[PDB]
Design a binder for this molecule. Structure first.
Ligand SMILES: Cc1cc2nc3c(=O)[nH]c(=O)nc-3n(C[C@H](O)[C@H](O)[C@H](O)COP(=O)(O)OP(=O)(O)OC[C@H]3O[C@@H](n4cnc5c(N)ncnc54)[C@H](O)[C@@H]3O)c2cc1C
Ligand SMILES: Nc1ncnc2c1ncn2[C@@H]1O[C@H](COP(=O)(O)OP(=O)(O)NP(=O)(O)O)[C@@H](O)[C@H]1O
Ligand SMILES: CC[N+](C)(C)CCCS(=O)(=O)[O-]
Ligand SMILES: [Cl-]
Ligand SMILES: [Mg+2]
Ligand SMILES: [Mg+2]
Ligand SMILES: [Mg+2]
Ligand SMILES: [Mg+2]
Length: 485
């Protein structure tokens, strides 16, 4: 008896722990659901809906290969392990690493208790191209900025392990344990709100493979010339799959690396450029793990402390307006609406709405981080923290802090004909393009004809940009003054 402990590596292909267990003797595939152990960050409704369907496909797969997935509901995953080994008679437990703060601790506490109880525990790399410790500068120190880190990752002395085949068969230790703990990922209220998700997404590794294929053989070619596109099938849509290890980044990297070689050869410039930007995307995810491991309180504590005494507005209705998409800036409200209704946001809108959150409303970034974590289909602690820290300006490589983006111009850049704003704001569905990104200026006759009553079915800017720059300054004058102490 060997135990395979699945957490966020829901796949049978290129899964090192599983492959090591099959090499060793029969297996008991285990998954333990223990949210309260996740603190302030238990999984949100749409993430849970994804987990529920991803696990079903995982179990279905494992059954095809010979064993079932045993699920356990508990308040302490370690304890559950013990009660599983101490009931099955297993001597080893194989699992794949995780690099988020909450996982880092529980994993150590896990190794200690189990090994110090007579259990062999082995741990592999299932989620990264390279372990964060394998990637370092010539002196041997962790890089402090993305570019230097990514340049090393791409110029390493050795290649990432190549995707392993899933087992061809698995033998299962005590099959009488197959009927285990039912996991409930939805209350009746939520079942209601989740009803459209199955129409747009197919959770699981099988479908993730499908998405990777689709992407590489289609949109990747125009990945680069298509990113100012706000709501189009121009990206991979792999994030939710990536978050639960349903798809191997190593496989992703290998397929992308083959296309790049073929396109370099052909001298297809668009292709190379798109390949480069997409690899930078995979790079950023790898970097979020790097930062979380080399700064264990990164999901709450900022890296740079130069904004330490900054007087962040703690205004509750500023927050509510943001969440409701009642800020007055069309592109910002469209994003909040699409996020609330679908749990999905293109990276540019994520930047647009989180940026408005810290520079215009000037709210604490931990609040935007948490809201995103509860509502995004790909909620990921490391990727969410990294994004918020970068936007707020607490990262070595963030853009200049004293800079406020104009949603009206972002509107012109990312949603030139107002199609995005009109899809997510039906109240503005009749407003012509000349005023779609700044309706508060518009002549009364256009508003009346479109059915828009400023302040009613569409609000006036909750904070003007000019007034915004001014509070930003007044806020800096203050933090500088607080520094003097
Ligand atoms: C403030 C903010 C919060 C974010 N929160 C999350 C989150 O909670 N979960 C999440 O996975 N991503 C998050 N991101 C990053 C990014 O927007 C999403 O990963 C991406 O939009 C998912 O779409 P895709 O799968 O089509 O990405 P693609 O463009 O197809 O890229 C492929 C993969 O690269 C990775 N990736 C791409 N961009 C980034 C990025 N900027 N940072 C980290 N990884 C990236 C993702 O795994 C993505 O699936 C956030 C970005 C910002 C600015
Ligand atoms: N250093 C970084 N750390 C974390 N995230 C980053 C970093 N740099 C960029 N990002 C993320 O990747 C996105 C794109 O990077 P950026 O440097 O803005 O190029 P870009 O978006 O292609 N610019 P543009 O060509 O005008 O569209 C950012 O908006 C963030 O989502
Ligand atoms: C536009 C991308 N959509 C279709 C919404 C998601 C891709 C489907 S999935 O779940 O198989 O990746
Ligand atoms: Cl500053
Ligand atoms: Mg698919
Ligand atoms: Mg795009
Ligand atoms: Mg698009
Ligand atoms: Mg940019």
């Amino acid at each position: 008896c060997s135990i395979v402990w699945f957490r966020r590596d829901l796949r049978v292909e290129d899964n090192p722990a599983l492959a090591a267990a099959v090499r060793a003797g029969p297996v008991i595939a285990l998954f333990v659901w223990a949210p309260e152990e996740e603190g302030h960050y238990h999984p949100g409704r749409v993430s849970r809906w994804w987990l529920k369907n991803s696990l079903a496909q995982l179990d279905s797969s494992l059954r095809s290969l010979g064993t079932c997935l045993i699920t356990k509901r508990s308040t302490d995953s370690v304890a559950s392990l013990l009660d599983v080994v101490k009931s099955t008679g297993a001597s080893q437990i194989f699992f794949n690493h995780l690099y988020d703060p909450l996982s880092l601790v529980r994993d150590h506490r896990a190794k200690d208790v189990l090994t110090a109880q007579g259990i062999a525990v082995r741990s592999f790399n299932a989620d990264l191209l390279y372990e964060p410790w394998e990637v370092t500068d010539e002196l041997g120190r962790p890089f402090s900025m993305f570019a230097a880190f990514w340049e090393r990752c791409l110029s390493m002395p050795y290649d990432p392990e190549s995707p392993l085949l899933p087992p061809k068969k698995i033998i299962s230790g005590d099959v009488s344990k197959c009927v285990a703990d039912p996991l409930v990922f939805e209350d009746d209220s939520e079942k209601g709100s989740n009803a459209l998700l199955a129409r747009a997404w197919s959770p699981g590794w099988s479908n993730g493979d499908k998405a990777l294929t689709t992407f590489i053989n289609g949109p990747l070619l125009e990945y680069s010339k298509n990113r100012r596109k706000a709501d189009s099938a121009t990206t991979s849509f792999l994030s939710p799959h990536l978050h639960f290890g349903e798809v191997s980044v190593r496989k992703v990297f290998h397929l992308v690396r083959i296309k790049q070689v073929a396109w370099a050869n052909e001298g297809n410039e668009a292709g190379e450029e798109s390949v480069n930007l997409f690899l930078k995307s995979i790079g950023l995810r790898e970097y979020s793990r790097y930062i979380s491991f080399n700064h264990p309180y990164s999901h709450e504590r900022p890296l740079l402390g130069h904004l330490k005494f900054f007087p962040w507005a703690v205004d509750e209705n500023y927050f509510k307006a943001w969440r409701q998409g009642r800020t007055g800036y069309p592109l910002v409200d469209a994003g909040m609406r699409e996020l609330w209704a679908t749990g999905w946001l293109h990276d540019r809108i994520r930047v647009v709405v989180s940026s408005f959150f810290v520079k215009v409303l000037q709210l604490p970034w931990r609040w935007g981080m948490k809201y995103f974590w509860d509502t995004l289909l790909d909620a990921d602690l490391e990727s969410d923290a990294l994004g918020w820290q970068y936007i707020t300006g607490t990262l070595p490589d963030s853009r200049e802090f004293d800079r406020i983006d104009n949603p009206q111009f972002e509107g012109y850049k990312f949603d030139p004909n107002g199609e995005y704003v009109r899809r997510w704001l039906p109240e503005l569905s009749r407003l012509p393009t000349d005023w779609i990104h700044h309706p508060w200026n518009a002549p009364e006759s256009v508003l009346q004809a479109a059915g828009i009553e400023l302040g009613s079915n569409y609000p006036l800017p909750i904070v003007g940009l000019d007034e915004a720059k001014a509070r930003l300054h007044e806020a800096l004058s203050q933090m500088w003054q607080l520094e003097a102490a």
